[PDB]
Coordinates of N, CA, C and O and ligand atoms in Angstrom, one line a residue:
X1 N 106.6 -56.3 -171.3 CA 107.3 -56.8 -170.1 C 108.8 -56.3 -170.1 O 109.6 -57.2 -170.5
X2 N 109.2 -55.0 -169.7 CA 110.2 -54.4 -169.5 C 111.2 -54.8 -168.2 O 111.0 -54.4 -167.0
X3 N 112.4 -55.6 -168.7 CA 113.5 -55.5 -167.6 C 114.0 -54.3 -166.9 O 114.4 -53.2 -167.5
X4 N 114.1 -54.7 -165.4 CA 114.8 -53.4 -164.8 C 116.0 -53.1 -165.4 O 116.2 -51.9 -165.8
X5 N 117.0 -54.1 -165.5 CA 118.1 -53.5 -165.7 C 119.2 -55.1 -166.7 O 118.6 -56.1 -167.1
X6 N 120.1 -54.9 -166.8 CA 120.7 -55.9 -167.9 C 122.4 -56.3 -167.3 O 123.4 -55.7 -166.8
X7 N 122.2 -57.6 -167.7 CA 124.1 -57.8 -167.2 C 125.0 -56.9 -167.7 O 124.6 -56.6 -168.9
X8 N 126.3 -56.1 -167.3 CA 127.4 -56.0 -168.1 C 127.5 -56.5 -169.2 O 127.1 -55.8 -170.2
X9 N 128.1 -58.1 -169.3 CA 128.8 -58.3 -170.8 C 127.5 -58.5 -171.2 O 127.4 -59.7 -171.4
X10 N 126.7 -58.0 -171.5 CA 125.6 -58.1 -172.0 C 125.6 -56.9 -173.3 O 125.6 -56.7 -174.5
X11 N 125.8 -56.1 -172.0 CA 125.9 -54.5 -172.3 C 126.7 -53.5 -173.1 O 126.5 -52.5 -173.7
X12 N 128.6 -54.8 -172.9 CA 129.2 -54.4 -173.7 C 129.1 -55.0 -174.9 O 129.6 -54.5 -175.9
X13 N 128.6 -56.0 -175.0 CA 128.7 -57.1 -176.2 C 127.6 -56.4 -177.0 O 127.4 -56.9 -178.1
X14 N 126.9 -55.4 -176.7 CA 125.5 -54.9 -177.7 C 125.7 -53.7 -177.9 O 125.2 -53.3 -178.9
X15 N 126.4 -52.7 -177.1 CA 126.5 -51.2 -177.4 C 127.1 -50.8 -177.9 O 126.9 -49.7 -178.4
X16 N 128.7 -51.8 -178.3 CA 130.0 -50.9 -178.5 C 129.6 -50.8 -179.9 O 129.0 -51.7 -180.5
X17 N 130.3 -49.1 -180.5 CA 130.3 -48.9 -181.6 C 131.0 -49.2 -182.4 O 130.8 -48.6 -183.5
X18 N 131.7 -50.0 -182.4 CA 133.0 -50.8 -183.4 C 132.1 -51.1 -184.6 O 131.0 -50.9 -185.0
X19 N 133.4 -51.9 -185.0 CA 132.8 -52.8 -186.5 C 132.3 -54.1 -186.3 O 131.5 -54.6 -187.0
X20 N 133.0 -54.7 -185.1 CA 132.7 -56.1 -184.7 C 131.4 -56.4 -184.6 O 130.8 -57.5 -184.9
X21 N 130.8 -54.9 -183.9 CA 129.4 -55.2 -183.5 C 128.1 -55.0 -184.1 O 127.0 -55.0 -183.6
X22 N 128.7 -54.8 -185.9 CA 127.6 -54.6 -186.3 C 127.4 -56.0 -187.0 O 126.8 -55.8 -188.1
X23 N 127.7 -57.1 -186.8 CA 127.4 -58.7 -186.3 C 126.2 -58.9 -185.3 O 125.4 -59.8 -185.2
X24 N 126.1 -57.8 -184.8 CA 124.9 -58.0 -183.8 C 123.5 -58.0 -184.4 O 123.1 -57.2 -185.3
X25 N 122.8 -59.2 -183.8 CA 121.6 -59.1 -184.8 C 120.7 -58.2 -183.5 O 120.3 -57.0 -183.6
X26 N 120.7 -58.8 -182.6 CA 120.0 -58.8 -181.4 C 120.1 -57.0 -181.5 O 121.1 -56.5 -182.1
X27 N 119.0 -56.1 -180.8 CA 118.4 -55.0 -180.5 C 117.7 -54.6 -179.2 O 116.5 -54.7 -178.7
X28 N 119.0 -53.8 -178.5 CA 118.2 -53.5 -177.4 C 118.2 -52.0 -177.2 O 118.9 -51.3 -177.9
X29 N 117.0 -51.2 -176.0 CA 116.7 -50.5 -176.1 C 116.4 -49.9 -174.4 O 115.3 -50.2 -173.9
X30 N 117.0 -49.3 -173.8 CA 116.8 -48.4 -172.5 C 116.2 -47.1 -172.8 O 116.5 -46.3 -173.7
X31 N 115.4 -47.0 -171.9 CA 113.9 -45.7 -171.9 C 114.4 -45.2 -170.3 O 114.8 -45.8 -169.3
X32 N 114.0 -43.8 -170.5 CA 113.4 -42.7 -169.2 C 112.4 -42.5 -169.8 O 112.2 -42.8 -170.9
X33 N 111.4 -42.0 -168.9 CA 110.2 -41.6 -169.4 C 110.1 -40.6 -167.9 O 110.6 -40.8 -166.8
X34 N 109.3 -39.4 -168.5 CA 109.0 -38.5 -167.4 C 107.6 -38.3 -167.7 O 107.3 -37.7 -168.7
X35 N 106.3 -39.0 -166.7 CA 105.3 -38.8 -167.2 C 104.6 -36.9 -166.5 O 104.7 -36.8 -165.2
X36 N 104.2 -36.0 -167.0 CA 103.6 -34.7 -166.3 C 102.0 -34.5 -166.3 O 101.6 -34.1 -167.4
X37 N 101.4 -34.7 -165.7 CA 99.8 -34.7 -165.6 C 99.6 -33.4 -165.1 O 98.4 -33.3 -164.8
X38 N 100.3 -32.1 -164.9 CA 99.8 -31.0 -164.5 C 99.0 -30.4 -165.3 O 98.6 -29.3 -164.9
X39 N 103.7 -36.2 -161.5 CA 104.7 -36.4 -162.5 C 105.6 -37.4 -161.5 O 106.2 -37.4 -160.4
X40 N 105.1 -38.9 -162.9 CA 105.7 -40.1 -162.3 C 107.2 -40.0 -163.5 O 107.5 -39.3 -164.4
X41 N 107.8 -41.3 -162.9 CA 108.8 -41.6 -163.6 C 109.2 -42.9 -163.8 O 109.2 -43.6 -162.8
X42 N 109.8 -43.6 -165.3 CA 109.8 -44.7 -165.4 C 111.0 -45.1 -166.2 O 111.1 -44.4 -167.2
X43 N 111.6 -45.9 -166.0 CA 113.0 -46.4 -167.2 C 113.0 -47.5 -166.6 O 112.8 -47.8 -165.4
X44 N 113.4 -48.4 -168.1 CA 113.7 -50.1 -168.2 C 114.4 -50.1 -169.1 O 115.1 -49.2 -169.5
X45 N 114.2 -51.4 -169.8 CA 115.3 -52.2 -170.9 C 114.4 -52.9 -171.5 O 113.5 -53.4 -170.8
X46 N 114.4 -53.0 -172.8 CA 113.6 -54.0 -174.0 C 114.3 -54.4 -174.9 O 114.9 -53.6 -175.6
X47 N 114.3 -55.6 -175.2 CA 115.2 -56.3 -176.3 C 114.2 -57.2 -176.9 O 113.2 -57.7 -176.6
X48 N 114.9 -57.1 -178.3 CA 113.7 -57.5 -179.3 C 113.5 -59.3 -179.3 O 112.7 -59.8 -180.0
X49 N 109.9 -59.2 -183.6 CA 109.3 -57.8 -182.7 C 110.3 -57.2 -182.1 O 110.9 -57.5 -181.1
X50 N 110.6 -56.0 -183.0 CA 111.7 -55.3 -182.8 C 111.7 -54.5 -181.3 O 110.6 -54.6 -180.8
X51 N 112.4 -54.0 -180.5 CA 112.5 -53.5 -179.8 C 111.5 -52.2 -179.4 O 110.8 -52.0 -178.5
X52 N 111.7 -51.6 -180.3 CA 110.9 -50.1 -180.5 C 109.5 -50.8 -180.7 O 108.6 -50.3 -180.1
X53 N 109.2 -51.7 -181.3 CA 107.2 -52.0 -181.4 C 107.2 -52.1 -179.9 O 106.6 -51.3 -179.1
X54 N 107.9 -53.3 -179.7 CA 108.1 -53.8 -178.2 C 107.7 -52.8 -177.4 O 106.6 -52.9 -176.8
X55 N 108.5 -51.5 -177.2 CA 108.3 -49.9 -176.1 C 106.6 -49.4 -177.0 O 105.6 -49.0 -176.5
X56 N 107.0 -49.4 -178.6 CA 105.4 -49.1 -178.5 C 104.1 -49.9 -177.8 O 103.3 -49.1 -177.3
X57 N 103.9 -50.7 -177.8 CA 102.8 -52.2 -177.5 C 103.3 -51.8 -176.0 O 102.2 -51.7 -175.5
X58 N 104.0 -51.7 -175.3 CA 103.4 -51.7 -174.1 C 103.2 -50.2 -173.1 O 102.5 -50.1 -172.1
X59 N 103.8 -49.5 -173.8 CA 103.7 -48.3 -173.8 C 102.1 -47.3 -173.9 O 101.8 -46.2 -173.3
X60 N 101.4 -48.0 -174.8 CA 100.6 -47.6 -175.1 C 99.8 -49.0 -175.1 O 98.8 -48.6 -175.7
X61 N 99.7 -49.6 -175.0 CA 98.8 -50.3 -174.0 C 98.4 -50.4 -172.2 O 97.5 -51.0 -171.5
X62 N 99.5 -49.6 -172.0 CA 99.8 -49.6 -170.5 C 100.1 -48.4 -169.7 O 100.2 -48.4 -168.4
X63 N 100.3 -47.4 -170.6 CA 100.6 -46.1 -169.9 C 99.8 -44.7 -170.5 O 99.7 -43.6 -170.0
X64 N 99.5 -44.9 -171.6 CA 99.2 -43.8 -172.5 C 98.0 -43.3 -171.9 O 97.7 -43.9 -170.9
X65 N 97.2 -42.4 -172.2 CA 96.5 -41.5 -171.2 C 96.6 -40.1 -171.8 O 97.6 -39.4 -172.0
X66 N 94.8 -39.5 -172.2 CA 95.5 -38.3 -172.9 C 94.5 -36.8 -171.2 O 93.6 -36.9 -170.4
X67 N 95.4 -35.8 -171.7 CA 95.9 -34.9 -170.7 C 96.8 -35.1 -169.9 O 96.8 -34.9 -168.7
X68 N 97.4 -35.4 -170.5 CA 99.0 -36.6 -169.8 C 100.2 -36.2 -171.1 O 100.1 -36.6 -172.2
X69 N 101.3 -35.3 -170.6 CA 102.7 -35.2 -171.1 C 103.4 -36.3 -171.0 O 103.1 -37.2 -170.1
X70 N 104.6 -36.6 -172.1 CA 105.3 -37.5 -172.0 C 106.5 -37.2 -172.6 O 106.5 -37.0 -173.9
X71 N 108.0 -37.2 -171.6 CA 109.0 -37.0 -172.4 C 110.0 -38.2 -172.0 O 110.6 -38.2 -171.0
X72 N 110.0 -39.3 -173.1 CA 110.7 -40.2 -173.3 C 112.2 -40.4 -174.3 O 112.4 -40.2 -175.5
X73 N 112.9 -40.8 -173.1 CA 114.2 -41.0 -174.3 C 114.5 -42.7 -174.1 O 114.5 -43.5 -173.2
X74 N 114.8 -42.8 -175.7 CA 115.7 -43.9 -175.9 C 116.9 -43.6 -176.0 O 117.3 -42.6 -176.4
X75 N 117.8 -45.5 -175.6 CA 119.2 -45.1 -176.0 C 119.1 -46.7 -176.7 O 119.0 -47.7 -176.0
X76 N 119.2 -46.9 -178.2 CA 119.2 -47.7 -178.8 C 120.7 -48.5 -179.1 O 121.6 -47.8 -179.3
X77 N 121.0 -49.7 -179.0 CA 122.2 -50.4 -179.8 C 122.2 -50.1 -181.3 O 123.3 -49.8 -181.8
X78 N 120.9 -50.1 -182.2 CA 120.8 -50.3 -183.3 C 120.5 -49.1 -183.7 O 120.5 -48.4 -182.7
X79 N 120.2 -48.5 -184.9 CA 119.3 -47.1 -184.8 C 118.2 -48.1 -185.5 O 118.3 -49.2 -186.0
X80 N 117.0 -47.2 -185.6 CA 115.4 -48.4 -186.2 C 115.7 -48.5 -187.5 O 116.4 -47.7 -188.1
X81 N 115.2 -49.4 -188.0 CA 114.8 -49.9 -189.0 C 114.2 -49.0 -189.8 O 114.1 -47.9 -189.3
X82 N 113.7 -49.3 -191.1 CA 112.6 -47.8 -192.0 C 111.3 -48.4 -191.4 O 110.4 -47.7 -191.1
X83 N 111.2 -49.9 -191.2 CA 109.2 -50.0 -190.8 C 109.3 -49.4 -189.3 O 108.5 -48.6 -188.9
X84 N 110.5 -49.8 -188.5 CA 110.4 -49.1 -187.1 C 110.1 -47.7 -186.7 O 109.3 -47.2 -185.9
X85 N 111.0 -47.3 -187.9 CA 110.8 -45.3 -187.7 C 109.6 -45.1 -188.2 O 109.0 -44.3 -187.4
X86 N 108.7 -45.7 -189.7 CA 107.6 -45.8 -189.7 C 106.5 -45.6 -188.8 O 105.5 -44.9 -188.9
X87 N 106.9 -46.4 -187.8 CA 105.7 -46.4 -187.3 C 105.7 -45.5 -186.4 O 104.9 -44.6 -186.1
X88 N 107.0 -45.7 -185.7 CA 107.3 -44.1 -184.4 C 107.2 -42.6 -185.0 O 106.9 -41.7 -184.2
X89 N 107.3 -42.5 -186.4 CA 107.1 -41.6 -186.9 C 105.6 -41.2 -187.3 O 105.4 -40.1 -187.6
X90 N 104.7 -42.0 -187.2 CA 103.3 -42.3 -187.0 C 103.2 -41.9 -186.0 O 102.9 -40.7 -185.8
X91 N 103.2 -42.7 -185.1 CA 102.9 -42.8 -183.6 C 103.3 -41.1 -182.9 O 102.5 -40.3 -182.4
X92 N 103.9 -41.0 -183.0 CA 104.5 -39.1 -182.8 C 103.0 -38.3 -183.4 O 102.2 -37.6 -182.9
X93 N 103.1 -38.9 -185.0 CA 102.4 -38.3 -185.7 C 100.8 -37.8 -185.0 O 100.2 -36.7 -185.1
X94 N 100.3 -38.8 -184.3 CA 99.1 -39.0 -183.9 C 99.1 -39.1 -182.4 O 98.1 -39.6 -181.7
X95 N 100.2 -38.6 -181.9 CA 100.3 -38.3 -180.3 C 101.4 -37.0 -180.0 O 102.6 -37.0 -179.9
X96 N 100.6 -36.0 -180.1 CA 101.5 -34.7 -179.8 C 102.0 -34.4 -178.7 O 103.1 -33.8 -178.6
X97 N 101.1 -35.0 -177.1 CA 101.7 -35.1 -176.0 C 102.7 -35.8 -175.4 O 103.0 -35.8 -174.2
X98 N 103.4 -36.5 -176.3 CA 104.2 -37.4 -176.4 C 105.9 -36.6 -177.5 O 106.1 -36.2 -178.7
X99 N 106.8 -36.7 -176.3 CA 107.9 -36.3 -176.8 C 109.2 -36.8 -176.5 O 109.7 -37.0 -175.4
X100 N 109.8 -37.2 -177.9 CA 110.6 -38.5 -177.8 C 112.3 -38.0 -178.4 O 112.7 -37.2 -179.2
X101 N 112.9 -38.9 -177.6 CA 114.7 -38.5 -177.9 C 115.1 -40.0 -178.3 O 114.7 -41.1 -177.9
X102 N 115.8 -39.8 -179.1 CA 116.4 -41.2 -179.6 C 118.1 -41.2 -180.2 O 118.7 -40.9 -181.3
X103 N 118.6 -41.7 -178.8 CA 119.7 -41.8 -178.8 C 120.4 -43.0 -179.1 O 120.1 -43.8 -178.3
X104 N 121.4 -43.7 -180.3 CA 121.8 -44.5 -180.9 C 123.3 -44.6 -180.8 O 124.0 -43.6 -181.0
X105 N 123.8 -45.9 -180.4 CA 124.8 -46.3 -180.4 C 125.5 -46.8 -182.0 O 126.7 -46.5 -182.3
X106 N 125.0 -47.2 -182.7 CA 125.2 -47.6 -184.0 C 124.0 -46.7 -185.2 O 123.0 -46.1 -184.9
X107 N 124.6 -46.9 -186.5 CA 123.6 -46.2 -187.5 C 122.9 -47.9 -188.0 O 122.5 -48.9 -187.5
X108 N 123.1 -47.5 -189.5 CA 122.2 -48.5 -190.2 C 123.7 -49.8 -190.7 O 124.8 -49.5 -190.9
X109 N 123.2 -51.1 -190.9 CA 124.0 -52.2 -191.3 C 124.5 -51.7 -192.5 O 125.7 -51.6 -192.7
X110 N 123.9 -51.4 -193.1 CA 124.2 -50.7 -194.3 C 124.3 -49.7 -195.3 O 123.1 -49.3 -195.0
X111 N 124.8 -48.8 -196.5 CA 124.1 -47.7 -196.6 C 123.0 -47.8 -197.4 O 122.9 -47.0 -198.3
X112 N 122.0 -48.5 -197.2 CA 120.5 -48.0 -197.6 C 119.4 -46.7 -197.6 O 119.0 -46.3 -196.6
X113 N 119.2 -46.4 -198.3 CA 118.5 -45.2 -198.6 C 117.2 -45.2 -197.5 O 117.0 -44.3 -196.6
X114 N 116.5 -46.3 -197.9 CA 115.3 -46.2 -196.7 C 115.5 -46.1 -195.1 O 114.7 -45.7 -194.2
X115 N 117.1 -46.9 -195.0 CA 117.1 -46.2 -193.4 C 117.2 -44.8 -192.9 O 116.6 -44.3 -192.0
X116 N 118.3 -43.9 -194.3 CA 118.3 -43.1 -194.0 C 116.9 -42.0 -194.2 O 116.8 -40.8 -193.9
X117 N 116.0 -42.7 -194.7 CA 114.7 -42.1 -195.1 C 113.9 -42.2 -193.7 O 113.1 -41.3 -193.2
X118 N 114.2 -43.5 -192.9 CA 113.7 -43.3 -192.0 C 113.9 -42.4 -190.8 O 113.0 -41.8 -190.2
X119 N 115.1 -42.4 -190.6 CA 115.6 -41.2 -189.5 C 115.1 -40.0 -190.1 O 114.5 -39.2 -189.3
X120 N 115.2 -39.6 -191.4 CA 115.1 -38.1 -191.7 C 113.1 -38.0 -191.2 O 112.5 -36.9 -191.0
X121 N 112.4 -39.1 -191.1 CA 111.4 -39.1 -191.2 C 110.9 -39.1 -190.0 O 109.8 -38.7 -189.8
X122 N 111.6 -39.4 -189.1 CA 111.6 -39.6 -187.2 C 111.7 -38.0 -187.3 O 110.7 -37.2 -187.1
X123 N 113.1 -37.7 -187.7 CA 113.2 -35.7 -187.4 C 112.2 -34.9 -187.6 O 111.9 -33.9 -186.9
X124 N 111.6 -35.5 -188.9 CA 110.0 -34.4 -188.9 C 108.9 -34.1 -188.2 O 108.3 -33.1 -188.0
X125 N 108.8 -35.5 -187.7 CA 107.9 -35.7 -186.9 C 108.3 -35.3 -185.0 O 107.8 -35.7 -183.9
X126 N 109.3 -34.5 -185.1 CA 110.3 -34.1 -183.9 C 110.5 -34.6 -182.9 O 110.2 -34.2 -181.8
X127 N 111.3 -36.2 -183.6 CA 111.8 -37.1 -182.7 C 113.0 -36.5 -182.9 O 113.3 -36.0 -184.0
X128 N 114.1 -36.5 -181.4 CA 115.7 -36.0 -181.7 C 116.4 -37.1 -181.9 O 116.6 -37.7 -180.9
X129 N 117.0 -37.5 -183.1 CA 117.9 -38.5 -183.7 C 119.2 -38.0 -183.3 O 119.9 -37.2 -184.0
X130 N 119.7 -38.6 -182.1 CA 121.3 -38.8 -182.3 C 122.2 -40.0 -182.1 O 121.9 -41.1 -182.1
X131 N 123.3 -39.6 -181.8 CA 124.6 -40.6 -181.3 C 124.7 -40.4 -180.2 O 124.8 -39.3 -179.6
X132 N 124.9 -41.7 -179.7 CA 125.0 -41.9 -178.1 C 126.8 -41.5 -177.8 O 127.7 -42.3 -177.9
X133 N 126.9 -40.6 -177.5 CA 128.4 -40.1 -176.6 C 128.8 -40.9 -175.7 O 128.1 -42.0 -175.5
X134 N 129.7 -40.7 -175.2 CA 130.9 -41.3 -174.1 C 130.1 -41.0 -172.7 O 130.3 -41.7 -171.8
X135 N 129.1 -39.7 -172.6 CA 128.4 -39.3 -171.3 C 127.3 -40.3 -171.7 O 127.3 -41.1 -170.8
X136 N 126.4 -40.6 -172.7 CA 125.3 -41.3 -172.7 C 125.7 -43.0 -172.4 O 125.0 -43.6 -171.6
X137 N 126.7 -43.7 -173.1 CA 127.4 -44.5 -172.7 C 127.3 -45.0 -170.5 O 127.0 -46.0 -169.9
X138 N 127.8 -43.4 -170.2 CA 127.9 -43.8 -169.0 C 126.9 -44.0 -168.3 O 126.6 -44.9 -167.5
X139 N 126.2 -42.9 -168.8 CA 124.9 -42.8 -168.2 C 123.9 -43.7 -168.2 O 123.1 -43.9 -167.3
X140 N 123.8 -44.6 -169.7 CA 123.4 -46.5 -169.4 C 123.7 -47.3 -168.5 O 123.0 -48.1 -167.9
X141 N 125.8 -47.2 -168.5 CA 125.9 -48.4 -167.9 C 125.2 -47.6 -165.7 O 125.2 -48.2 -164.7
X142 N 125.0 -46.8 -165.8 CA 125.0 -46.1 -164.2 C 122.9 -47.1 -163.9 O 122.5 -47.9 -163.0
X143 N 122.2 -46.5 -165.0 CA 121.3 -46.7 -165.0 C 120.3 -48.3 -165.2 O 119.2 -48.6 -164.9
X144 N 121.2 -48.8 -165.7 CA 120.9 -49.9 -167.0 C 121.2 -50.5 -167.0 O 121.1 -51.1 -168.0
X145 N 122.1 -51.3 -165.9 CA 122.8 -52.3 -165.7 C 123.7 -52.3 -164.7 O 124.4 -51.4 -164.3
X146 N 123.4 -54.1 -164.2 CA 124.0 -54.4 -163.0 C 125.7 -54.2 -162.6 O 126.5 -55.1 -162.2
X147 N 125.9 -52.6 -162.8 CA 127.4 -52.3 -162.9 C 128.2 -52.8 -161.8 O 129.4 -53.0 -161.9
X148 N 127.4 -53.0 -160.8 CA 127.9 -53.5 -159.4 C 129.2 -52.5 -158.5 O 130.2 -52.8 -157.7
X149 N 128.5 -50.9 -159.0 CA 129.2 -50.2 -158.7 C 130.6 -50.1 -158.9 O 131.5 -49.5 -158.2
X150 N 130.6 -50.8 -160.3 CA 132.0 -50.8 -161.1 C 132.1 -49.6 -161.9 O 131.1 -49.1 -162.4
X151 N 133.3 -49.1 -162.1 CA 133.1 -47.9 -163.2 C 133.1 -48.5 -164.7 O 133.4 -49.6 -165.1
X152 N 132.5 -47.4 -165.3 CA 132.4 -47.7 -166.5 C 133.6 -47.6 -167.6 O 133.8 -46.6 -168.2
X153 N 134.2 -48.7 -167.7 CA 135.4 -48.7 -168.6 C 134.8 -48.6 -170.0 O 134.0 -49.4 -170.4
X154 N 135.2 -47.4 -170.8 CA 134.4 -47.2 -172.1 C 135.8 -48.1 -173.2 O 136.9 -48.0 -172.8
X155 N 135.6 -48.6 -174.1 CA 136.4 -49.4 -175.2 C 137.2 -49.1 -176.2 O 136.8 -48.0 -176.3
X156 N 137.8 -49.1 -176.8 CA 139.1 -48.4 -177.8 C 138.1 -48.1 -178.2 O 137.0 -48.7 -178.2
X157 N 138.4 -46.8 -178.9 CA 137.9 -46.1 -180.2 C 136.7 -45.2 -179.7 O 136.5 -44.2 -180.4
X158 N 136.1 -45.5 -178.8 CA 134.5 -45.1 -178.7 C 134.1 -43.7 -179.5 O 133.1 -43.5 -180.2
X159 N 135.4 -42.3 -179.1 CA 135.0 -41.2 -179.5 C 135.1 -40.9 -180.6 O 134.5 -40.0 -181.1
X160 N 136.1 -41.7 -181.3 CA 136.2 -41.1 -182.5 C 135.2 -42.5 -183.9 O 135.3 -42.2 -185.1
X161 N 134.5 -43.4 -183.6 CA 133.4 -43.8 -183.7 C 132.3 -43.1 -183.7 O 131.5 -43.0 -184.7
X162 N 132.2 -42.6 -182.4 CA 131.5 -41.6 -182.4 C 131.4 -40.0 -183.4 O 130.4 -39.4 -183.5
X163 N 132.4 -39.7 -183.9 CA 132.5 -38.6 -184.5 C 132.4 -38.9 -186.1 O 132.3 -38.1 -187.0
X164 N 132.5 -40.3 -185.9 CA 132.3 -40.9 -187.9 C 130.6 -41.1 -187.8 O 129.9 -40.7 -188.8
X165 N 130.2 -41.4 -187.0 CA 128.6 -41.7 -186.7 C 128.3 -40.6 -186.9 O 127.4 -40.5 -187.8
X166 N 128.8 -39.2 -186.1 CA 127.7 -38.4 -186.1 C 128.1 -37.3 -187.3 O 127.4 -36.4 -187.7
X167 N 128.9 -37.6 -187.7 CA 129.3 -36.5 -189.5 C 128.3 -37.6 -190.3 O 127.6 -37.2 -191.2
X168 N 128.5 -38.4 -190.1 CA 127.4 -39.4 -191.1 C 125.8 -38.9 -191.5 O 125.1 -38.5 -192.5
X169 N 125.3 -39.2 -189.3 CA 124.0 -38.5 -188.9 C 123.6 -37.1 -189.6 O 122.5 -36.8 -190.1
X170 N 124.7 -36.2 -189.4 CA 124.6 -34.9 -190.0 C 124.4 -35.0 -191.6 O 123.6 -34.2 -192.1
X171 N 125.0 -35.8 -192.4 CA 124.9 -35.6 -193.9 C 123.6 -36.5 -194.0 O 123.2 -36.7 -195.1
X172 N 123.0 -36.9 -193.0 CA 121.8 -37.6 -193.3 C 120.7 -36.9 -193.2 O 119.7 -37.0 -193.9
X173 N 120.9 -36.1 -192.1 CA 119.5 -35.1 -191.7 C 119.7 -33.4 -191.9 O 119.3 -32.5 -191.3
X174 N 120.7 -33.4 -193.0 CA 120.5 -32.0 -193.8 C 119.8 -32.1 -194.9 O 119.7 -31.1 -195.6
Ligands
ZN201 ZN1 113.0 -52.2 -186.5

């Protein structure tokens, strides 16, 4: 049961990349999906049963279909868990028509080895692990919430947050 779209302070209280917000327990997750049968199209919001089972379970109880392409992106608050990527790393595994982007606002709570085992283990299975930019940012709040045709004011710090995330990302998936 995927929401169309999500309040503002909702939106900022869960995405921003700061420090504050890795306080956040809560996990949400906006999808595109472009389905190709040669072509429908679908994006919502799931908040967490983590978020990602959540998009898997209904996803594939409700849309999957084989002779049927699938290029879906997420844009995560959280990046997954190691059982999360487990299983998306599965689920890839055993659906080749199925092609997935996963774009992350935050990394792991902590430096744990198994998260970083998980992402490296998403890449294999050729899911694209990244950081959500200042364009992906906007492109949520345009998409994904009740912006009310407000512009998107992005928050101190975002880009250079951004550039500690993704030298991080990089020393994780070399
Ligand atoms: Zn998880």
């Amino acid at each position: 049961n995927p929401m169309e779209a999500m309040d503002p302070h909702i939106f900022y209280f869960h995405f921003k990349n700061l420090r504050k917000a890795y306080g956040r327990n809560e996990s949400w997750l906006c999808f595109t999906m472009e389905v190709v049968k040669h072509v429908s199209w679908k994006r919502g919001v799931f908040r967490n049963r983590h978020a990602e089972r959540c998009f898997l379970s209904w996803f594939a109880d409700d849309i999957l279909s084989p002779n049927t392409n699938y290029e879906v992106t997420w844009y995560t608050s959280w990046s997954p868990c190691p059982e999360c990527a487990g299983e998306v790393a599965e689920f890839l595994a055993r659906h080749s028509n199925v092609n997935l982007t996963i774009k992350t606002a935050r990394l792991y709570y902590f430096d744990d080895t198994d998260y970083q085992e998980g992402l490296r283990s998403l890449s294999q299975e050729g899911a694209s692990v990244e950081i959500m930019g200042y364009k992906d940012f906007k492109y949520c709040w345009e998409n994904f919430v009740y912006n009310d045709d407000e512009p998107f004011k992005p928050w101190d710090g975002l880009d250079y947050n951004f550039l500690d995330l993704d030298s991080k990302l990089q020393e994780i998936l070399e």
